[PDB]
């Protein structure tokens, strides 16, 4: 909705539109752009957008697993995904998608690369949303590996970009907010993810982001799942209810993953589902169908 809510900012720990109101934005997340990029169009979005209500979309592109290390032509995608957001008003996050390279640090040089080029492009777009380092995890912790990760790329990003949002990934798959918070950035438009899946984390994760808002640091889901954390074993919908009232609760935005027709329990459509939208409620999973209706609420 930036047609409405155009240039985004954080008021505190509140992020606020370009009147200056609260916004809390609802959308879902691609799976690996270099599997399932094909679900990500102008055509796709544009039904996201208006069958589903999506106010943001979560372009994954992912730097291992055959992802943009290795094929780095997948930023194509990326660029395809933003141009398709500015055409059709919803906000875009770009998502450096590190997972099986858990240590930010291991990509850094391509990282900056990465991120010079798409602030160049897309630095006066307020559509475009930076999420630099998706899950560190590993022996990986905030004031040793990923804070100063986040200072070089966000300084390279603000040379291009005064202003767009950041989102900087936290400890144990994006976890440990309660550390950044301890220490955290500088920038005025940073903010720090949290993910969960409803399968598997409660109230400690829970406590965590409530200790993190507490020091003022924000906190925008950028990935959550309906399933257990490994993506599969069934759809826990009383606790993706319980979290999603939490995230209410505290204004937070929020990004569900994933938009594929990968067969585990967390894509949101059935295998032969279009790859440019029109999908009937029998076209989308358990999964898809829940997380539709509190996208449109």
């Not at 799942?225 to 319980?242: H, I, K, M, P, W």
Request: net charge negative.
């Amino acid at each position: 909705p930036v047609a409405k809510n155009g240039q985004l900012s954080i008021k505190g720990t509140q992020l606020v539109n370009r009147d200056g109101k609260a916004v809390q934005l609802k959308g879902i997340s691609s799976h690996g752009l270099q599997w399932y990029g094909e679900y990500v169009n102008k055509d796709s979005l544009k039904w996201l957008r208006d069958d589903w209500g999506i106010t943001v979309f979560r372009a994954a592109m992912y730097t291992a697993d055959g992802g943009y290390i290795d094929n780095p032509s997948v930023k194509n995608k990326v660029k395809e995904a933003v141009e398709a957001a500015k055409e059709l008003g919803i906000y875009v996050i770009i998502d450096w998608h590190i997972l099986n390279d858990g240590n930010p640090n291991q990509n850094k040089e391509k990282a900056k690369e990465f991120f010079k080029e798409m602030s160049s492009l897309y630095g006066n777009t307020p559509n475009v949303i930076y999420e630099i380092a998706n899950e560190p995890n590993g022996d990986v912790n905030w004031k040793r590996d990923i804070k100063p990760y986040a200072e070089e790329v966000i300084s390279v990003i603000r040379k291009n970009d005064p202003d767009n949002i950041i989102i900087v990934g936290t400890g144990t798959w994006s976890q440990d907010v309660n550390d950044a918070a301890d220490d955290q950035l500088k920038d005025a438009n940073v903010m720090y993810a949290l993910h969960f899946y409803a399968g598997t984390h409660g109230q400690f994760l829970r406590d965590k982001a409530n200790y993190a808002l507490s020091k003022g640091a924000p906190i925008f889901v950028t990935e959550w799942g309906t399933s257990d954390a490994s993506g599969n074993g069934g759809v826990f919908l009383d606790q993706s209810r319980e979290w999603l009232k939490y995230l209410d609760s505290k204004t937070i935005s929020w990004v569900n993953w994933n938009l594929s027709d990968k067969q585990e329990s967390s894509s949101a459509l059935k295998p032969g589902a279009s790859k440019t939208g029109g999908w009937r409620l029998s076209d989308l999973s358990a999964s898809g169908t829940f997380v539709r209706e509190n996208i449109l609420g």
